[PDB]
Amino acid sequence: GIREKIKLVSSAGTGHFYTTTKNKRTKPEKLELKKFDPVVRQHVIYKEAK
């Protein structure tokens, strides 16, 4: 949507990534979240756009 998508990279050095629709139009402070990495099986931060 007009809220756009953000693509964040794994803090495990993997090429596999995470993508979400997180809206900034009311809440603009950056998304920087932990998720399960399916290539190393760890719980890591996904950070920094593109």
Least distance from RNA to the Cβ atom of residue 48, Å: 14
In angstroms, the CA 38 to CA 43 distance is 9
Helical H segments across the chain, by residue range? none
Binding to RNA by CB under 7 A, coded x per residue (else -) over 28-47, reads ---x-xxxx-x--xxx----
State the residue for tokens 């920087």: 32
Among 13, 16, 30, 48, binds RNA (CB under 7 A): 16
Six-digit token pair at 31? 């998304």
**Counting contacts by CB under 7 A, is residue 13 touching RNA?**
no
Tokens of 2: 């007009």
Binding site for RNA (CB under 7 A): 1-3, 7, 15-17, 19-23, 26-27, 31, 33-36, 38, 41-43
